[PDB]
């Protein structure tokens, strides 16, 4: 698996975890598969091997992977310990480094060391004098002999005390002691031995492993790919597909047992993103609004509606017989203003039709011209402002009369027959950041090795940059202004008198019909005109990423308010100013990936930065790994088939299907579940998905990353078991309602994992089978997803992680006629069936034997692969196996 | 140092050309990367470097100089540089290097994005002089990578 | 005192295990010819001869 090993190389494994006997034991192994070792000369060969092995102790930082100081030592030739496993066929030695056992030998149980070397369970590892010992004796660190001195190391050497007090030492002096191993090249048995250990030692800092790796993050099934014309970037370009998993190995040993780990993914795309975005709301003063226009609300994807916000000094709005009551009100410097939120619809409604749960209005300071934000309160002192409806049948006009200070103003809204909404289409700087989590506990310590999703189903916040500018005409007594935000959005401010304010603003939602009216940006810019020494027109604007749930517009969080100033020492003046503007969208997790496709932040273009987080003991990986999203179209590969592979029930047909993108579990005989939780990362908690290894779906509670977090009993337990009746397939058992929280090696149930809404999977990927002349098909409506235990092909030799995954799918097929028409109790045997874990069986009657065939259609288990290769015709691959016309 | 591309005759079966920046004295023991943005600004970031008890921080050690195109009936076409396009054509926060004790930073501009910006064919036909650059504050140099695309 | 210098490789500047060695000739600055050693002094009426 990982770390990779070379021919005759040296590697290490730390003994730690839940149930560890003692912290500080490191097992150094050297591969002795190159020569054969018997029990009559094992002492000699191990003596030579430990004579040729050297152990390096290094000083570094607790955040870096850069060698800062190194010293070498060697095992003694007298009083040392050496062992040899003939089943795992490697020579291994245990060394005690950390507290308590640093210079005192300790006994290592066979059963716990068997976790990192299974072979010790079958054949008892050899020791010196040719005796097979049942327990391992650790070589004390203080007994090692210096290579450059020829003497055993002292008891007061700095690295020894550092190991003996590692916790306090690394905590205080921020110096890190890292061990490693090397094998001086030598020839024995006609074969050479030499190598060095990929850092897999007692505890390296919590970063993504980059040595000697040229990328750091990588996926073995990418290495074993059919790169037709992309052969100039094979190992140069760490690409991943759609929602598939990319492997990482986090070195982290600051805790014992299982360690949750948080991941943050940053997606960027080479292209200025042209976004069409709808106006979820318009907020402006009664004078700032036009006297008359045509408007109709835009219906959203969650029941929300577009509404208008009228701000007036009047206590009410009057439209003749209709009166509008305070939706909300606020006060600045003693002056009171009323904000009324009205939905333009098919009728006038007094009752609250929707709500805003948090909206902050900004205004410049009277004395310092600095932004000040206040939450609008209702007439009953509530921070959830109601939003009503006004309007009627198409063509109806309503004239709302309000007061701006002492001046009456009117606005005439015409109810159009079609939504008369203002839509902004602008080029914007955009990128995305998403969060994920996974509990990792593997027998590869210090490597916590796992695979992370390319796009997890979590709260994905798309961030972005644009510009805001303000132009204004300034006089001695009044000043008018306009502001441009989001690169094409315009707001106006009538001539603002002295010491007076004028409010305007917009709430904008993505115009795509999947996140419209679910996430938004709220900008409320107030303006103040004043004269202290020069005529000053100041603008203060808030920035609120915003979300809709239960028809309530609730604020997720608020950004730093921005401020602009226009100063004029002359009576007539024209002034301008500019500032950056921040765009943010916390998309709903269910649509988050879809939103990532909608904004164009995924495909063959995207590049992904990865950061890790020690969720238990609070470390952030200063290292940021990298990979790239790309889509390779699935292909097919077939060969002529012998009739012998159809006759006897031991000869079958193997079909090779190329589709890297359907892999969502690159580990044979493995499975995992997922659950939504508030994940702790950096200094805040964001909704995310924690992945739990195993086959049980739980219902955790509390705040992830604290003592509040505690996973409860298994809500359901998924088990792949043999099913009675016809044949003997291995199929899933459990509550299918949690297939969206379950993932396996099988790609015919992994589309539930991310793209699932209302209990049904949006995506439909993986293998599919049809069979003729007797029409049979799988997945069938009578079989739940996961009706086989199909395992992906193991990774080959050049892959750094052998036996994980391979884009080639080798499917085993039997085509026959003989057992068709048979009876199993009351069941009839005819058509297509699943057997074993990877076997498909097609049975046809006597009349359908001539030309009986199976057609295999493999579809990507990825949304991007379906989208990007629909035109080329290479997103699904089909092939056929048929009974040959034989003489 | 140098800045170049996988090939000078890349066909349109792949729609993303990775920019190779090989800087001798710019790297560190892996990992080490470069944030890019604003003006292709090489925010060289390696918090994984330590030199006797001190961690490393951001070093604003370069920026992509320009992306110019030759169109010469007599005209060396120096492109008027637009900030938004330039930052978004190189938005990658982490360009990791490859070899230890040697800067082999990996960046990249994709063909589909440039074509969508230019409203051209996806992979059918597209060709200009397409000369991107990079300025390194390593020794203060201007490296250039020129490319022309073949239909297929 | 004299000085001795040689061309320097950039590799001796990149990784924190490769450094630059500069050779300076000055015999006269040695006042303690023993590595990892030190000593102190004090004024006293020393007995010598008679």
Author numbering:
A (entry chain D): 1 to 887
B (entry chain A): 888 to 1039
C (entry chain A): 634 to 683
Question: How does the study describe this entry?
Answer:
To address this knowledge gap, we performed cryoET and subtomogram averaging (STA) on S. acidocaldarius exosomes with improved imaging conditions and processing techniques. To analyse the in situ structure of the S-layer, we performed STA using Warp, Relion 3.1, and M and obtained a cryoEM map at 11.2 Å resolution. We fitted our structure of SlaA into the S-layer map, which provided an atomic model of the assembled lattice. SlaA assembles into a sheet with a thickness of 95 Å. The long axes of the SlaA subunits are inclined by an angle of about ~28° with respect to the curved S-layer surface. Six SlaA monomers assemble around a hexagonal pore of 48 Å in diameter (glycans not included). The D1 domains of these six monomers project into and define the shape of the hexagonal pore, together with the domains D3 and D4. The D3 domain of each monomer overlaps with the D4 domain of the following monomer along the hexagonal ring in a clockwise fashion. The triangular pores that surround the hexagonal pores have a diameter of ~85 Å and are defined by the D2, D4, D5, and D6 domains of three SlaA molecules.
In archaea, S-layers usually form the only structural component of the cell wall and thus act as the final frontier between the cell and its environment. The Sulfolobales S-layer lattice stands out from others because it is a two-component lattice, consisting of the S-layer-forming SlaA and the membrane anchor SlaB.
